């Protein structure tokens, strides 16, 4: 839980001033004002949509979700209103496969990649009982969303250091890319789909493109293979005084 990249080599996460404004009885929040407001809305538009580059006649259909956001200052309700939009399903649901839609919900709303096939198949268990709105509100009303983001900050890609699986850090680095990278470049076709269902890992050059500036992006590759052989049984011996002991 130290995480040597997070507030050192990246920026600080954006969001509202505090969460004590909800208990204030003459206001609802520290009132930001329309220069301090819309530059936070620029960071929700760059995160829920990727870099989708939404036009002026596509933002006009999102007029109602901002007008509620500048009165009720909850960030989580703004993210929930933008994921049930037409502009979220015409980019990430309409021409994609099912695990491509699921792997972008982990990117846009959690900042991580899915850790399992069992965690991934339970999101298709919620598709059968309520469609795509049952997937979206179960991510938003989860415990993992509450104890990382809450109502206060935008859901950002967080370098944690103490990931519950090491593979979770790998699939986060494939999902986000560089800053000149959107998420329409594959023709559908989930990137993490082979590695979730089989149990293997990712490619080292695809992860090191998305690492920050100043973190040895790519070195360490020996010129032999990049993954491990599960069938190999090596002999690793320890020197004692007399000989060499192969505690296998």
């Amino acid at each position: 839980a130290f995480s040597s990249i997070q507030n050192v080599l990246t920026d600080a996460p954006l969001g509202t001033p505090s969460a004590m404004g909800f208990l204030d009885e003459r206001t609802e929040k520290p009132l930001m004002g329309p220069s301090e407001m819309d530059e936070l809305v620029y960071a929700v538009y760059k995160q829920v949509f990727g870099n989708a580059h939404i036009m002026e006649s596509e933002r006009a259909e999102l007029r109602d979700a901002e007008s509620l956001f500048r009165y009720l200052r909850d960030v989580r309700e703004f993210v929930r209103a933008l994921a049930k939009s037409n502009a979220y399903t015409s980019r990430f649901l309409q021409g994609n496969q099912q695990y491509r839609f699921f792997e972008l919900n982990f990117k846009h709303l959690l900042g991580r990649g899915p850790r399992s096939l069992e965690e991934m198949a339970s999101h298709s268990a919620l598709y059968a009982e309520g469609g795509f709105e049952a997937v979206i509100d179960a991510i938003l009303d989860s415990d993992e969303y509450a104890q990382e983001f809450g109502s206060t900050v935008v859901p950002y890609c967080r370098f944690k250091g103490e990931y519950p699986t090491n593979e979770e850090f790998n699939r986060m680095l494939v999902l986000k890319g560089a800053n000149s990278t959107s998420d329409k470049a594959g023709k559908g076709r989930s990137k993490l789909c082979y590695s979730i269902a089989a149990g293997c890992s990712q490619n080292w050059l695809s992860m090191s493109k998305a690492l920050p500036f100043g973190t040895e992006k790519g070195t360490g590759f020996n010129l032999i293979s990049s993954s491990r052989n599960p069938a190999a049984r090596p002999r690793i011996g320890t020197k004692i005084p007399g000989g060499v002991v192969f505690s296998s």
Partner: peptide, 20 residues
């Protein structure tokens, strides 16, 4: 920046339950 003693939609509830 999350400040653990905090909620999101029971905060919606009790302002429309103390009036009730």
């Amino acid at each position: 920046r999350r400040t653990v003693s905090f909620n999101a939609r029971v905060a919606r509830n009790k302002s429309q339950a103390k009036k009730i």
